[PDB]
Symmetry: D2
Subunit: 252 residues, 4 copies
C-alpha cells in the first residue's frame, strides 16, 4: 500500500521506511534535505524502492503523495527536534515553542491533512514516533520531554475518534534507539564506539544495549499491516527496559 515516512534520514526514519518497502508498500519519504535537488536525487538513486519527495510543509506533502500514488494508507510521523538540556529559567520561551511546533504541531498537522480520506475509505494506520522520555525523565529537559508526552497523548486521544472509521492510531516511544549516522538521537559515535557511552547504555537498559533500527521497523510494519489493529491507542515503550534503577549500596 502507500505509506509516508517523515524525516526519513533520522531517528526512526530508515528502519520504518525500509521495512515498510520490504512489506511491499510504496513508501514516500519526507526530509529537510530534500528541499534541494542533489539530495532528493541522490537518495532516490541510493534507494530505488523509496520515493523521496521535496514537499516540506504537512498538507502539501499529503496532497502530493495522494496525487502521485493514489492515496495515503499509512502515515509514520517520525518527529524530531534537537534536545537542549537547560535549567528551566535558562531557556527562552521560544525554545519551548520550538519543541512544541516540531513534536506536537507537526504530527497533528499531518493527521489533520490525511484523516479525511482515511475516514472515507474506512481504512488507514497512523504511527507517531515519539519518545519514552516522559516514562523516565532526565532532569533539565523539560521542553523536549513534555512536548513528547503531548504527542503520545495525541495519538491515544485520536485512537478514540478514529476507531469508528477502522483506523488504528499508535505511538512508539523510543529511547536509546541506535540512529546510525543520524545525530537524532543515538549516533554510532559515541554511542557504540566510546566505552563511557557503552558502559552507560549497559547500565541503564535491561537488555544492556541500544535498540536497533531493525526492531523499530519490525514494529512499524507489524502495526501498519492490519495484523493487530485491536492494539489501537497503545503507546509502546521501545526502550529495552529502561530505566534500570540504581539499587541499594552493597548490591550489584
Amino acid at each position: 500500500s502507500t505509506a509516508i515516512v517523515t524525516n526519513v534520514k533520522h531517528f526512526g526514519g530508515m528502519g520504518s521506511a525500509l521495512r515498510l518497502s520490504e512489506a511491499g508498500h510504496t513508501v514516500a519519504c519526507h526530509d529537510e534535505s530534500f528541499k534541494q535537488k542533489d539530495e532528493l536525487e541522490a537518495f532516490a538513486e541510493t534507494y530505488p524502492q523509496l520515493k523521496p519527495m521535496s514537499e516540506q510543509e504537512p498538507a502539501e506533502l499529503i496532497e502530493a503523495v495522494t496525487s502521485a500514488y493514489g492515496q495515503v494508507d499509512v502515515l509514520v510521523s517520525n518527529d524530531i527536534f534537537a534536545p537542549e538540556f537547560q535549567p528551566i529559567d535558562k531557556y527562552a520561551v521560544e525554545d519551548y515553542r520550538g519543541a512544541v511546533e516540531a513534536l506536537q504541531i507537526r504530527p497533528f498537522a499531518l493527521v489533520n491533512a490525511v484523516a479525511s480520506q482515511m475516514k472515507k475509505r474506512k481504512s488507514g494506520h497512523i504511527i507517531f514516533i515519539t519518545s519514552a522520555a516522559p516514562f523516565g525523565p532526565w532532569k533539565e529537559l523539560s521542553t523536549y520531554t513534555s512536548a513528547r508526552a503531548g504527542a503520545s497523548t495525541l495519538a491515544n486521544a485520536l485512537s478514540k475518534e478514529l476507531g469508528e472509521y477502522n483506523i488504528p492510531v499508535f505511538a512508539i516511544g523510543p529511547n536509546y534507539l541506535h540512529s546510525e549516522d543520524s545525530p537524532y538521537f543515538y549516533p554510532t559515535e559515541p554511542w557504540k564506539t566510546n566505552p563511557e557511552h557503552v558502559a552507560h547504555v549497559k547500565k541503564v537498559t535491561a537488555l544492556q544495549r541500544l535498540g536497533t533500527q531493525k526492531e523499530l521497523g519490525e514494529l512499524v510494519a507489524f502495526l501498519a499491516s492490519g495484523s493487530c489493529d485491536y492494539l489501537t491507542g497503545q503507546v509502546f515503550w521501545l526502550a529495552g527496559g529502561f530505566p534500570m534503577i540504581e539499587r541499594f549500596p552493597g548490591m550489584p
Copy 2:
C-alpha cells in the same frame, strides 16, 4: 508567603485563591478582566483579602508581585482554554497551536520567569491546574486533551530539576469541577440545574456529583503548605472517580 493565582475568576481560580488566603498567604490574583481598572477594583472590593493585579504577561506579572509583596513563594498556574470538540480533520492546525499556547506555553513561561528567585532561596511551590482528560479521553477533543498532558508532564519533568532546590512541583488534573459562574468548565448552569446534566454527572463519576471549588482549594493549599513536599512530581486526578465505565447488559447502572 505570597501566592500567585492566575485566571482567578475561572476554573480553579477562586477555590485556590480563597483557600490560600484562608491559610494565611497573601494572594496576588491575575485575570484577563483585570487589564480594566473597573474590573480590578470591583474584585478587590468584593474580596479585600485578595490582591488583584492588572499585569497580563508572565515576566511582567511575576515582577509586579515581587516588587509589591516581597517575593513569590507559590505559583498556581490555573490555565484555561475554551475547548472545542471537532473531529481531527475539522480542526485547524491553529486550533492546536492555540490550545498549546494557552495550556503549555503559559505555565512554562510563568515557571521560566519565577524559578530563579525560588532557586536562590531554595524554597517555593509550583502547582499547575491541568486536567484529567488524558486519563479518560473523550473522542473529538484531541487538541485540549493532548495539550493538557503536555502541561502535566511538564510539572513532572520540572520536579526532577527543582527538587535539588527544595521546590516541589505538582499538577492537579480536575474533571467535572464545579465552576460556579465561570464557563470553564462546569457552571452551576446547566451542570447543577438541568436534569440531563445532573443525571450525566451522576453516571460518569464514582461520587455521582461535581467536585467542589472547596475540594480543589484545600488540595492546592495542602500542597503549597510544606506539609507534603515528598509528593513532588505527582499528577493528581481530581475527578471523583471518573471515568465510570459501562458494564455488561443486565447489570445495574
Copy 3:
C-alpha cells in the same frame, strides 16, 4: 523452538497456539481437560500441528516439555479465572485468594520453573496474557482486576532481571477478546449473536467490535519472534480502544 501455551482451549490459548504453530514453533499445549486421555487425544486429532500434554502442574509441565521437545524457548501463560462480580462486602476473602492463585501465582510458578534453563542459554521469551481490566475498571470486580494488575506488574518487574540474559518479558492485557466456544471471556454466544451484547461492544470499544483470536495470536507470535525484543517489559492493552467514555448530553454516541 518449543513454545508452551496454557489453558489452550480458553481465552488467548487457541489464537496463540495456532499462530505460534504457523510461525514454525513446536507448540506444547496445557489444559485442565487434558488430564483425561480422551480429551487429550481428541485435541491432538483435530490439531495434528499441536502437541497436547497431560501434565497439570508447573514444574511438572515444564519438565515434560523439556524432555519431549528439547527445551522451552517461549512460555505463553494464558491464565484464566471465572470472574464473579460482587460488591466488596459480598465477596469471601477466599474469592480473592482464589483469584490471586489462578492469576498471579500460576504465572509466577511457571516462570520460576522455566527461567533457569533460559538464563543458561541466554535466550527465551516470556508472555503473560493478563487483562486490560486495571486500565478501565468496572465497579464490583475488585478481586479479578487487582490480581490481573499484579500479574502485569510481575511481567514488567521480571523484565528488569531477565534482560541481562536476553530474555524479553511481556504482558498482553486483552479486553472484549472473542473467545469462540470458550466461556473465558467473550463467547460467540451472546457476544456476537444477542442484539444487546452487539450494541454494548459497539459503544464501549473504539473499533466497535470484539478483538479476534487472530489479532491476539499475531501479537503473541510477533513478540515471541525476536523481531522486537526491545519492547521488553511492556504491558500491551489489547482492547480496541476501550474504554469509550460517555460524552456530554447532546453529543452523538
Copy 4:
C-alpha cells in the same frame, strides 16, 4: 472520629496513627507485638492518645473496634512484608504466596470486614499504604513489587464501587520513607547514619532525602478529613521524585 491503623509500629504506622490523633480521632492500633500483654500495655502507656488492640486477624479486629468505639470511620491499611531480593528461579512459590497474603489479601480482608457499615452510613475513608516500587522497580524483587501493584490497583478498583456510598479509597505508595526504629523499610541506621546510604538517597530522589513520617501522616490525615474526597481512587507516589535517572556521560 474512629480510625484504625494497622501494623502501627512499622512503615507508615506511627506517622499515620499519631497524626490522626492530633486531628481529634480515636485511633485503634493493630500490631503483631500486641498478641502479648507487656507490649500492648507498654504501648498504651507510652501513647495515651492511641488505643492498641490485641486483635490480630482482620475481621476480628474490625468487630472489636466497632464494639469498643461504636464504628470504624477510617481504615489505614499499613501493610508490610520483608523484601527478599532473589532472582526469579531462586524463590520458592510459597515466597510469592507469602508476599501476596501480606500485601494484597490483608488489605482486601480488612475492607471486606468494614465495608458494610461504611456503606450503610454512606460515610468512611479507606487508605492503603502500598509502595512506589511498581513505578520504578529494582531488579530481583518481583514478589514484593507485583503484590504491591495488586494492592494499589485494589484501592483504585474499590474507589469505583464505593463512590456511590460516599466512601473515598486511596492508595499511598511510598519509597525511601524514613521508618525510624522500624526495619520496614528505611531505618535510621543505616539510611541516615552511613555515607554509602545517604549518598544513594541523595542521588536517586529529586528532593535528595528520605520521606518523613510527618509528611505521610499529613497526607493520611488530609485524606481521612473529608477535605478532598474528590481525589478518590488516587494512587499517590510519596517518593520524593524517585527515580532520578542516570544522565549521559559528561553531565552532572
